[PDB]
Amino acid sequence: ALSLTADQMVSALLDAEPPILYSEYDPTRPFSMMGLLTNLADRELVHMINWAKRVPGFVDLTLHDQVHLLESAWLEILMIGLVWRSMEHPGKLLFAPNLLLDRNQGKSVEGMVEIFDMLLATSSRFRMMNLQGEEFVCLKSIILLNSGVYTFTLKSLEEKDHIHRVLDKITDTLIHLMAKAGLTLQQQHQRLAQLLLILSHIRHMSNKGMEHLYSMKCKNVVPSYDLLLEMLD
Amino acid sequence: ALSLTADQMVSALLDAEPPILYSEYDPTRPFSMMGLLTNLADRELVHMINWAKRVPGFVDLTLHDQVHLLESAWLEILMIGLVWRSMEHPGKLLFAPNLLLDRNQGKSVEGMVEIFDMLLATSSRFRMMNLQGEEFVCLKSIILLNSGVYTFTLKSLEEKDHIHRVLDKITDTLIHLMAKAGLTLQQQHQRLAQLLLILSHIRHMSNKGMEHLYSMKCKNVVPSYDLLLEMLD
Ligand SMILES: CC(C)CN1CCc2cc(O)ccc2[C@@]1(C)c1ccc(/C=C/C(=O)O)cc1
Ligand SMILES: CC(C)CN1CCc2cc(O)ccc2[C@@]1(C)c1ccc(/C=C/C(=O)O)cc1
Numbered sequence: 001a002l003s004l005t006a007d008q009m010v011s012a013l014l015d016a017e018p019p020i021l022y023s024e025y026d027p028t029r030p031f032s033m034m035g036l037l038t039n040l041a042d043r044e045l046v047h048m049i050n051w052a053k054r055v056p057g058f059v060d061l062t063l064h065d066q067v068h069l070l071e072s073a074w075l076e077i078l079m080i081g082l083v084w085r086s087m088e089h090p091g092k093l094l095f096a097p098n099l100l101l102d103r104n105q106g107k108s109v110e111g112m113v114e115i116f117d118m119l120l121a122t123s124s125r126f127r128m129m130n131l132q133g134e135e136f137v138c139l140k141s142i143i144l145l146n147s148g149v150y151t152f153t154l155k156s157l158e159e160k161d162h163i164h165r166v167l168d169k170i171t172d173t174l175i176h177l178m179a180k181a182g183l184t185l186q187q188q189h190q191r192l193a194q195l196l197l198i199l200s201h202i203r204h205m206s207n208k209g210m211e212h213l214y215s216m217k218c219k220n221v222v223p224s225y226d227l228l229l230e231m232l233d
Numbered sequence: 234a235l236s237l238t239a240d241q242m243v244s245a246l247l248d249a250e251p252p253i254l255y256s257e258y259d260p261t262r263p264f265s266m267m268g269l270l271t272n273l274a275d276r277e278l279v280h281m282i283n284w285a286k287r288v289p290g291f292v293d294l295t296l297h298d299q300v301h302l303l304e305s306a307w308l309e310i311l312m313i314g315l316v317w318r319s320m321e322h323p324g325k326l327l328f329a330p331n332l333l334l335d336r337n338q339g340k341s342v343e344g345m346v347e348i349f350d351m352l353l354a355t356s357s358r359f360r361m362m363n364l365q366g367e368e369f370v371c372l373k374s375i376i377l378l379n380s381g382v383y384t385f386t387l388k389s390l391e392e393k394d395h396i397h398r399v400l401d402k403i404t405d406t407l408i409h410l411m412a413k414a415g416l417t418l419q420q421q422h423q424r425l426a427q428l429l430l431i432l433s434h435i436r437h438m439s440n441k442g443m444e445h446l447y448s449m450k451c452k453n454v455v456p457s458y459d460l461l462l463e464m465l466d
Binding site: 118121122125142146147150151164167168171172175185186188189190192193194196197198199200201202203204207208211 | 351354355358375379380383384397400401404405408418419421422423425426427429430431432433434435436437440441444
């Protein structure tokens with residue numbers, strides 16, 4: 001994991017990529033948006049667990065630390081996947097290939113249009129930077145590893161140290177991709193920063209979305225510790 | 234602003250630095266924690282406005298964009314200042330030189346100890362990285378410029394472009410500082426990433442803290458648009 005080259009890191013991440021899922025609704029019936037979106041998110045989470053298990057370094061950690069990292073990152077990870085899928089659909093969010101929604105469609109649930117707008121703006125930003133696939137898979141792994149690493153014993157100290165070393169390797173990998181594409185050393189550092197700074201915004205979006213979900217006050221919304229632990233164990 | 238050298242950027246930021254304020258309580262009287270903390274934050278905000286006005290590039294923007302950026306960033310900026318002040322006080326938060334508080338003192342307000350713990354962990358992280366003063370002032374300017382830039386006309390497009398160019402200059406400046414301290418090119422990129430990734434955590438802390446403040450349901454808590462506009466105008 002720490003012994004991987006940049007090219008091997010990129011290949012491993014590209015190979016771990018989850019599939020694009022479809023919404024479950026009968027397309028022959030007239031057109032619950034939140035029901036459809038929740039069911040989709042539920043099914044995505046299962047594939048997210050399998051993906052996480054394939055990110056180099058992640059299964060080197062304890063089970064309890066894997067659960068903590070996923071608990072902190074899951075909504076950010078769904079969000080960055082959505083934004084990526086939506087990049088070539090200006091003004092629309094591609095929740096699934098059969099569920100491409102605009103901001104006006106978001107207005108049907110109190111509080112949702114604000115979150116829709118933020119996600120659309122992030123997609124616009126990705127389009128302006130011309131984000132590449134190989135850069136995207138790196139960023140998504142950085143989110144997994146970083147989002148919970150500040151909120152966790154000798155074992156904990158070793159785990160945090162390992163997470164930081166894996167993150168360094170992903171940083172090396174990003175810069176290598178940018179070097180391969182022909183950017184100058186200045187451009188490399190500038191773009192690295194531009195990418196990492198978007199991750200703060202993805203965090204913000206996730207916090208706003210978690211507030212929405214918690215506000216539903218429902219046991220069948222937001223995956224519990226125990227459900228994540230059961231799927232990861 | 235865009236014509237500044239790295240060294241001139243660092244000098245301008247170091248010169249803009251606000252003062253360290255004191256809590257207002259009679260030290261001869263027996264020991265309201267939230268009252269003291271709110272009064273301190275109120276007075277800090279005034280100095281924050283003056284600081285912001287001295288960050289290169291910031292007064293090149295429209296008044297409405299300056300207000301938006303401050304509205305998005307103010308709590309992150311107070312938080313990164315607190316964490317910096319607290320760096321050489323393991324297990325304590327130096328809200329002011331006469332108000333140095335531990336996690337047990339946070340437990341006196343429902344919900345506060347969790348936020349205290351996060352801030353202490355960030356201080357610990359800064360101590361482990363050995364963050365320098367010159368790096369800190371850069372990060373604080375990046376927060377000002379970046380936090381609201383994804384949530385904003387031809388003028389808006391020009392403003393966002395300018396913000397991104399100033400952010401590039403701050404990135405150049407960081408790397409120059411790291412080059413001046415003798416780090417290799419690898420170490421430079423690795424540390425740049427490590428620093429920027431902590432900014433996601435500061436965002437998260439701020440969202441958690443904003444949720445606390447809004448939950449108070451009080452007109453004399455959280456600065457309004459109009460108050461920020463009045464102070465900035
Ligand atoms: C308000 C946000 C939490 C809505 N998010 C936006 C990001 C996103 C990305 C997806 O790829 C699929 C769905 C979503 C939704 C629409 C969403 C996320 C989670 C849930 C509920 C999950 C649960 O209750 O366990 C519902 C909608
Ligand atoms: C719950 C958090 C919002 C508490 N924060 C933590 C960061 C911080 C940094 C300071 O340097 C000074 C105070 C604080 C406090 C304790 C804080 C921040 C804002 C307010 C209220 C501001 C307002 O009501 O306008 C109260 C406490």
